[model samples]
Target: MKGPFTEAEDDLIREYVKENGPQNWPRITSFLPNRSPKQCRERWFNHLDPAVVKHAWTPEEDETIFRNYLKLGSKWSVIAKLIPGRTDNAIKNRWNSSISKRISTNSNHKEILLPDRS
Candidate 1:
């Protein structure tokens, strides 16, 4: 459970998803005997999905996350809606890793800038 998925496993998931779509995690588990339904789903959504953004966070995205976090608290899912291509997992990780530290360490940091509600 702790080990990383192999390339062959990733290939199996990618092929199955391509043919049957991404809706059936339980079925996908049949292909990946070692992975659970939750694991399959998480793997697909977090790493394999073509729509998932794998690049570094931009300054604008950082600002957006920080501003929304002020209003939304740790509602990662809601905050992710404001920033396209970023998943709740990724946003939460970013917050925990860097954004939270930035806020904690900088008392004079700017907070006047706000995210658009629309």
Candidate 2:
């Protein structure tokens, strides 16, 4: 599993990306000791990127999740691509928690579109 990152490392990542531009993470990972290319990319997307919107889910966003879930059927990454500024992890968590709760509550239901990752 990936370990936690310090603010100092986070700052370094932000600075490096800002100064150098967002290029292939494998190239950037060399500068970031103790982190892999995938780690660097995930960290950048989930935490560092200014483009990522950190806000409460609006009703419209909830509708989008459900609509996409019904159509795509548990492809969180694909669904996330449709919703800008939302990460796959964020969408996965919400879908799992919300849909899992409903599934458990409505136990008699035959099927659910969302797959629980856990």
Candidate 3:
């Protein structure tokens, strides 16, 4: 029954992580009693962490994701490693939302371009 995080809670988590770094989620829970360790970890990595890039996806990034996905086959952690500043969750979401459509469309184009047996 956890609810959405408040601004105050987000601030507290940010301050704590700033002083102590982002490790040790269990320690963070002591300061934010309402939030679980797992929640705090996700919040930091997915939103609060400075390293994460929140900007709109560039065409280059989209191509990187598509190329890596072909080699990695949904191994998001590995794909994320290839893509700096992008989390696995973000990469997965992009794939589901747009890249998957692109993939299907490209496959259709490839089929059309293939040599005819007849």
Candidate 4:
């Protein structure tokens, strides 16, 4: 079974990898160290990276979500369902800011429909 790497285990992995590289991943996993390579990779990627999520959301992407929301309200996943490039977190963050702006713009002037009315 899989278990989290303890301090000692983490140190062991550190020592192992310091002596090796990617090739050492499986080697480390086989040992008594706590985490597997997959877990190690995830830990490094999700937490250790300076930039965890990307900064930009394209116009086309925004429109796609908007279009889908037209047919399905608050259903960002419905629109993002098919997209493979960006994570759900990215999609949700962009949607939250964009939809809020859309509401603000529309509320200011009732006559003007939000570009997509979606």
In the order shown, the candidates' Cα RMSDs to the true structure are 5.5, 5.0, 6.5, 8.5
Instruction: Provide the lDDT at 104 for model 1.
Output: 38
TM-score of each: 0.83, 0.75, 0.82, 0.40
Question: What's the C-alpha lDDT at position 109 in model 2?
Answer: 65
Ranking by TM-score: 1, 3, 2, 4
The sequence of per-residue lDDT tens digits that candidate 2 reaches over residues 22-90 is: 676778755767788788778888878887888877757766887777668889889889899998888
Model 3 agreement with the true structure over 1-118: per-residue lDDT tens digits? 1878888888988988887888887888668787888988888898778889988887778888887777668999888888889999999998898767655435445311111122
Better of 1 and 4 by TM-score: 1
Reference-based TM-score, model 1: 0.83
> lDDT, candidate 2, residue 95?
73
- lDDT (CA) per prediction: 0.79, 0.75, 0.78, 0.55
Highest TM-score: which candidate?
A: 1
| TM-score-superior candidate, 1 or 2 | 1
